[PDB]
Amino acid sequence: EIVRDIIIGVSDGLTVPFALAAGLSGANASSSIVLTAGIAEVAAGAISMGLGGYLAAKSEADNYARELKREQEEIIRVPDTEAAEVAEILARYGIEPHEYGPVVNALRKKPQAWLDFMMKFELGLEKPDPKRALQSAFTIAIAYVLGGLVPLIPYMFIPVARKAVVASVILTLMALLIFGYAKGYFTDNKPFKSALQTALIGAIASAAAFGMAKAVQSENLYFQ
Amino acid sequence: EIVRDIIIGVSDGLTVPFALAAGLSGANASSSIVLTAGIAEVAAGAISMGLGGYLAAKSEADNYARELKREQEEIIRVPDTEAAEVAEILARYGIEPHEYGPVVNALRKKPQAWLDFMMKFELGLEKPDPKRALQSAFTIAIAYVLGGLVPLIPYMFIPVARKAVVASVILTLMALLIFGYAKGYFTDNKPFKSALQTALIGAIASAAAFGMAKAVQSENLYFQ
Ligand SMILES: [Zn+2]
Numbered sequence: 001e002i003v004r005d006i007i008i009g010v011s012d013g014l015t016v017p018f019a020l021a022a023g024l025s026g027a028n029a030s031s032s033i034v035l036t037a038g039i040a041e042v043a044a045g046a047i048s049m050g051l052g053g054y055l056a057a058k059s060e061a062d063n064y065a066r067e068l069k070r071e072q073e074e075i076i077r078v079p080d081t082e083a084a085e086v087a088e089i090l091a092r093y094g095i096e097p098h099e100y101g102p103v104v105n106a107l108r109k110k111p112q113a114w115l116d117f118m119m120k121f122e123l124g125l126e127k128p129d130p131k132r133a134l135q136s137a138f139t140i141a142i143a144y145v146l147g148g149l150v151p152l153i154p155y156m157f158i159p160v161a162r163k164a165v166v167a168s169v170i171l172t173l174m175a176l177l178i179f180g181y182a183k184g185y186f187t188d189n190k191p192f193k194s195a196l197q198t199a200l201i202g203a204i205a206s207a208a209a210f211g212m213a214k215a216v217q218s219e220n221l222y223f224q
Numbered sequence: 225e226i227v228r229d230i231i232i233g234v235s236d237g238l239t240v241p242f243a244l245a246a247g248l249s250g251a252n253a254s255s256s257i258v259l260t261a262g263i264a265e266v267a268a269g270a271i272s273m274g275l276g277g278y279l280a281a282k283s284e285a286d287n288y289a290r291e292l293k294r295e296q297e298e299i300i301r302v303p304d305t306e307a308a309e310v311a312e313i314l315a316r317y318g319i320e321p322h323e324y325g326p327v328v329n330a331l332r333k334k335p336q337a338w339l340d341f342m343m344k345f346e347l348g349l350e351k352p353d354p355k356r357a358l359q360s361a362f363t364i365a366i367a368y369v370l371g372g373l374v375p376l377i378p379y380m381f382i383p384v385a386r387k388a389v390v391a392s393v394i395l396t397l398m399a400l401l402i403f404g405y406a407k408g409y410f411t412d413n414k415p416f417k418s419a420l421q422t423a424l425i426g427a428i429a430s431a432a433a434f435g436m437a438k439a440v441q442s443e444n445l446y447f448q
Pocket residue numbers: 071074081082083085086118
C-alpha cells in the first residue's frame with residue numbers, strides 16, 4: 001500500500017510536470033516561465049492528492065464503521081432477515097442447507113464471525129487502520145512533489161528552456177525507466193514492460209502538451 | 225464505478241487546472257499564457273490518466289486471471305495443501321471442524337465454489353469485466369478534460385488575465401460546489417459537506433499555486 005502510494009504517486013509527478021514543462025519549452029517559453037508554471041502545478045497537485053487522499057480515507061473509515069453498525073442493527077432487530085442474506089451466501093457457494101443450518105446456530109450465539117462474514121461481503125472485508133489512512137496521504141503528497149521536482153531541476157540551472165528541455169528529457173526518461181522497473185519489481189511481474197510503458201505515457205502526453213502549447217501560441221510571434 | 229470515475233475524474237480537472245490558472249493570473253501573466261499552460265496541462269493530464277487507467281485495468285485483468293490459475297494449480301497438484309489454507313478460512317471464522325469437514329468433500333467434487341472462496345480471499349473476489357476496464361479509462365479521460373475546460377473558459381473570452389480569473393474563480397467554485405454535492409448524492413452521504421470540502425481543496429491549492437507562482441517570479445519586474 002505505502003510502497004504503491006509512494007511509487008504510484010511518483011509516476012504522476014514525473015509525467016505531467018514533465019509534459020507541461022516540455023510543452024512550454026516547445027512553444028518558446030523561458031525557463032523561468034516553465035518553472036513558474038511547473039512549480040505552481042506540482043504544489044497544486046500535491047495539495048489536491050494530499051487532501052483527496054485524506055478525504056476518501058477519512059470518509060471510508062467512517063463509512064465502513066458506519067456500515068459495520070447498520071448491518072449489526074439489521075442482524076439484531078430482525079435476526080432471520082440477516083440470516084437469510086448470509087444463508088444466501090452459504091447457499092450461493094453450493095453448500096446444501098442441512099450442514100450450514102447448524103452453522104447459523106453457533107453463529108447466533110457468537111456475533112463476531114457470522115457478522116464478520118456478512119460484513120466481509122457487505123463492506124468488502126476491509127476494516128481499515130486509522131493511522132495508515134493519514135500515512136497514505138502524506139506519502140503520496142511527498143512522492144508527488146519529489147517526482148515533479150525531477151523534470152524541473154534542469155530549468156533551475158539552465159535559463160534557455162530549449163537547452164534545459166534536452167537535459168529534462170533525458171533525466172526523467174531515465175527516471176521513468178527506473179521507477180517503471182520498480183513498479184514492476186513489486187505488484188505485477190515483468191518490470192521491463194512496466195519500464196517501457198511508463199516511458200511511453202510520458203512521450204504520449206509530453207507530445208500532446210507540445211501539440212497544444214504550440215496550437216494556442218499559434219498566432220503570436222514570440223511567446224506571449 | 226463509472227459514476228465514480230466520471231465524477232472523481234471531474235474533481236481533478238476542476239482543481240489543478242484552476243489552481244495553476246489562478247496562480248499564473250496572480251503572477252501577472254497574460255490570459256494567453258494561462259491558456260497555453262492550462263491546455264497543455266489538461267491534455268497532459270487526460271493522457272496520463274487515460275493510459276494509467278488502462279494500464280492498471282489491463283494489468284489486473286491479466287493478473288487476477290493469472291492468479292486465478294496459480295491457485296487452481298495449487299488446488300490441483302497438492303489438494304490437501306489448498307484444503308488447509310481454506311480449512312483455515314473455515315476454521316478462522318469460529319467454525320468447528322466436524323461440520324466443515326464434510327463441506328470440503330462436496331467441494332473436492334465440484335471445483336468452482338471451493339475454488340471461488342479461496343479465490344475470493346486470494347484475488348479479493350474481484351473477477352473483472354474486460355470491456356468496463358476500457359470504459360473506465362475513456363470516461364475518466366473525458367471527464368478530466370471537461371473539468372479542465374471549465375476553469376479555462378473565461379480566459380478564452382477575456383484577454384486580461386486579472387479580469388478573467390475573477391470570472392474563473394466564481395465559475396469553478398460554482399462547479400466545485402455543484403460537483404461536490406453530486407459526489408455526496410452518491411457514495412457517502414452528507415452532500416453539503418462534500419460540496420464545501422471540494423471547494424476547500426480548490427482554495428488550498430489555488431492559494432499554494434499562487435504562493436509559488438509569485439515566489440518564482442519574485443525578482444522579475446514583469447512576467448518573464
Ligand atoms: Zn445481511
